RNA sequence: UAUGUUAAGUGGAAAAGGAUGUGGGGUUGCUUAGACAACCAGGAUGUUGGCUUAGAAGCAGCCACCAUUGAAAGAGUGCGU
């Protein structure tokens, strides 16, 4: 979280507590996260899970992860360097079962690869990712993922904007990716990577 | 009375700019045809090349335009005898380039028109503050 | 409206009147609307 | 804040009539927070004081807690009955009476000290003046 | 009876805290060579200061924050685009 804060975030002023202490985080926190390419997403951070866990933890539990349960995308993050890490995600994927996190889009990032010397730092293999939380190109990596999940549904368009309305061309500049900008004396040409959403919005154009 | 008597302010390089940036949505709302201007303003491309020209567009009582040139940028002036294209990020905190007076000798002459202060040294010291904002060290 | 013991200025457009003995701030942010 | 060590474990609540014999006029910082009438400051309100006043410095200038907590006090659980001695020790308390300048600081503006002071001073059972050197 | 105070039925329950209530004191800045309030001009010029950015032209953000005409005007106090 702190990572893709610090990377893609408009107030990268506001990290989350980090510490190498058992259950550090007890509440949810939401950051709002603006690809370069200027596609939104919301990163949001919840409490950790530790085997047994209290059967009457778990009905509060269920509170907290209620918008992983709502989520579009659910990242679970496994230690690798730790040798008992199979032992870890099963574990963890029991306690989401009785949390009630159903039929969600799951992508099994396993992180702390500084840790090894034998694995290579950015990996994938399908819904496997290696990568290290310390490291910006991991981070680079996570969020090219989280794009090819997320916003799929963007597909590219061509738009004709008279000069009388700019704030059209603004509106281009800021919700969605410009691949190309055209100058005409009539108006402006942009063909860009929009939503369905912006193609009933633009549709005049 | 008729369309607008108002007037547009705006500057341009010496290469003609049918885009947004400057003259798009400047030229575009007052009505004018643009690519007319790119077959006029070349007349004041010819005698001054690279450097930016603020330029003066006067739509009349008729729906017509008439260009009205004015004298090139005090900062973009200054970026000659500096042999640089960008200015500085921090200025004073770390200068980039250094200028003599020599050459704004000259530029207190090229913009006396323009400047309001009718003595010829004033428009020396006015230069020299446009270079603390730029981010150049000077000498006499 | 916010009905509160502590009235006080949120901004500095916010202003202190007092209206049928009460202690009010008013402002054109309408958020800071207070009663005492 | 806790005594390392007490020669007893209980001890009387005493009694806070009259003006602290010392410690009324600030001696180490530039503003002092002077308790105007007295009150049992617990622990737990000088550590939320203390906080309170040196998150709003942001780890500048000092901060002197010039009052600690001496003394024990005890409790009775609910559904205890009264006799069969005396309760258990509960927290610490220092008995602050009027006139005893509780925190000091230094190394700030006036403004700062002032603003650092009035959010200390919220934490705090007992009436206080912001009083400077 | 005398001189003051209070507008709350306070008097005739209730705290932290909050506040353009009202009376009295006491310091103190400006002021008939004209203040403070309003009303009448002006509020310019380099210049869209530079960088940054599709755009940033006082006014997204960062760094500077000089001079100029004189009555003086910030490289701009808020909105606005
Ligand atoms: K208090
Ligand atoms: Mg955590
Ligand atoms: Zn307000």
Request: aromatic letters at 8%; a positive charge; hydrophobic letters at 40%.
């Given at each position: 979280?702190?990572?893709?804060?610090?990377?893609?975030?408009?107030?990268?002023?506001?990290?989350?507590?980090?510490?190498?202490?058992?259950?550090?985080?007890?509440?949810?926190?939401?950051?709002?996260?603006?690809?370069?390419?200027?596609?939104?997403?919301?990163?949001?951070?919840?409490?950790?899970?530790?085997?047994?866990?209290?059967?009457?933890?778990?009905?509060?539990?269920?509170?907290?992860?209620?918008?992983?349960?709502?989520?579009?995308?659910?990242?679970?993050?496994?230690?690798?360097?730790?040798?008992?890490?199979?032992?870890?995600?099963?574990?963890?994927?029991?306690?989401?079962?009785?949390?009630?996190?159903?039929?969600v889009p799951v992508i099994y990032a396993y992180n702390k690869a500084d840790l090894l010397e034998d694995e290579?730092?950015?990996?994938?293999?399908?819904?496997?990712?290696?990568?290290?939380?310390?490291?910006?190109?991991?981070?680079?990596?996570?969020?090219?993922?989280?794009?090819?999940?997320?916003?799929?549904?963007?597909?590219?368009?061509?738009?004709?904007?008279?000069?009388?309305?700019?704030?059209?061309?603004?509106?281009?500049?800021?919700?969605?990716?410009?691949?190309?900008?055209?100058?005409?004396?009539?108006?402006?040409?942009?063909?860009?990577?929009?939503?369905?959403?912006?193609?009933?919005?633009?549709?005049?154009? | 009375?008729?369309?607008?008597?108002?007037?547009?302010?705006?500057?341009?390089?010496?290469?003609?700019?049918?885009?947004?940036?400057?003259?798009?949505?400047?030229?575009?709302?007052?009505?004018?045809?643009?690519?007319?201007?790119?077959?006029?303003?070349?007349?004041?491309?010819?005698?001054?090349?690279?450097?930016?020209?603020?330029?003066?567009?006067?739509?009349?009582?008729?729906?017509?335009?008439?260009?009205?040139?004015?004298?090139?940028?005090?900062?973009?002036?200054?970026?000659?005898?500096?042999?640089?294209?960008?200015?500085?990020?921090?200025?004073?905190?770390?200068?980039?380039?250094?200028?003599?007076?020599?050459?704004?000798?000259?530029?207190?002459?090229?913009?006396?028109?323009?400047?309001?202060?009718?003595?010829?040294?004033?428009?020396?010291?006015?230069?020299?503050?446009?270079?603390?904002?730029?981010?150049?060290?000077?000498?006499? | 409206m916010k009905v509160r013991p502590s009235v006080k200025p949120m901004c500095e457009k916010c202003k202190v009147?007092?209206?049928?003995?009460?202690?009010?701030?008013?402002?054109?942010?309408?958020?800071?609307?207070?009663?005492? | 804040?806790?005594?390392?060590?007490?020669?007893?474990?209980?001890?009387?609540?005493?009694?806070?009539?009259?003006?602290?014999?010392?410690?009324?006029?600030?001696?180490?910082?530039?503003?002092?927070?002077?308790?105007?009438?007295?009150?049992?400051?617990?622990?737990?309100?000088?550590?939320?004081?203390?906080?309170?006043?040196?998150?709003?410095?942001?780890?500048?200038?000092?901060?002197?807690?010039?009052?600690?907590?001496?003394?024990?006090?005890?409790?009775?659980?609910?559904?205890?009955?009264?006799?069969?001695?005396?309760?258990?020790?509960?927290?610490?308390?220092?008995?602050?009476?009027?006139?005893?300048?509780?925190?000091?600081?230094?190394?700030?503006?006036?403004?700062?000290?002032?603003?650092?002071?009035?959010?200390?001073?919220?934490?705090?059972?007992?009436?206080?003046?912001?009083?400077?050197?």
């Open positions: 979280m702190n990572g893709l804060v610090r990377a893609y975030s408009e107030t990268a002023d506001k990290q989350v507590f980090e510490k190498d202490m058992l259950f550090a985080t007890l509440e949810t926190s939401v950051r709002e996260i603006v690809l370069p390419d200027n596609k939104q997403f919301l990163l949001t951070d919840t409490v950790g899970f530790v085997s047994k866990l209290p059967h009457q933890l778990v009905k509060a539990f269920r509170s907290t992860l209620e918008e992983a349960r709502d989520a579009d995308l659910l990242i679970h993050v496994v230690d690798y360097s730790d040798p008992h890490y199979k032992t870890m995600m099963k574990t963890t994927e029991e306690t989401l079962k009785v949390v009630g996190v159903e039929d290579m730092y950015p990996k994938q293999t399908g819904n496997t990712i290696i990568f290290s939380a310390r490291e910006e190109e991991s981070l680079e990596f996570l969020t090219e993922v989280i794009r090819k999940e997320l916003f799929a549904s963007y597909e590219k368009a061509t738009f004709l904007i008279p000069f009388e309305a700019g704030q059209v061309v603004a509106y281009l500049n800021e919700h969605a990716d410009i691949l190309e900008t055209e100058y005409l004396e009539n108006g402006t040409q942009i063909v860009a990577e929009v939503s369905p959403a912006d193609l009933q919005k633009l549709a005049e154009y | 009375a008729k369309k607008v008597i108002k007037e547009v302010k705006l500057q341009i390089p010496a290469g003609k700019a049918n885009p947004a940036p400057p003259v798009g949505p400047a030229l575009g709302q007052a009505g004018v045809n643009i690519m007319g201007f790119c077959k006029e303003f070349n007349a004041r491309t010819a005698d001054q090349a690279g450097l930016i020209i603020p330029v003066v567009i006067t739509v009349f009582e008729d729906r017509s335009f008439t260009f009205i040139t004015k004298t090139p940028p005090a900062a973009v002036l200054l970026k000659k005898a500096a042999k640089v294209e960008k200015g500085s990020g921090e200025p004073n905190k770390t200068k980039v380039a250094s200028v003599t007076r020599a050459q704004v000798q000259e530029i207190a002459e090229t913009k006396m028109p323009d400047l309001n202060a009718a003595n010829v040294e004033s428009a020396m010291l006015m230069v020299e503050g446009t270079a603390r904002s730029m981010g150049i060290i000077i000498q006499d | 009147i007092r209206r049928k003995g009460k202690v009010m701030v008013i402002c054109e942010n309408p958020k800071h609307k207070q009663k005492q | 804040l806790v005594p390392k060590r007490v020669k007893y474990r209980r001890e009387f609540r005493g009694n806070m009539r009259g003006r602290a014999k010392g410690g009324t006029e600030v001696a180490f910082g530039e503003y002092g927070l002077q308790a105007v009438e007295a009150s049992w400051i617990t622990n737990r309100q000088i550590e939320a004081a203390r906080i309170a006043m040196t998150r709003y410095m942001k780890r500048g200038g000092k901060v002197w807690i010039k009052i600690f907590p001496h003394k024990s006090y005890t409790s009775k659980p609910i559904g205890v009955r009264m006799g069969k001695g005396k309760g258990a020790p509960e927290g610490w308390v220092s008995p602050v009476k009027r006139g005893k300048i509780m925190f000091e600081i230094a190394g700030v503006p006036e403004d700062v000290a002032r603003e650092a002071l009035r959010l200390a001073a919220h934490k705090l059972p007992v009436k206080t003046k912001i009083v400077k050197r």
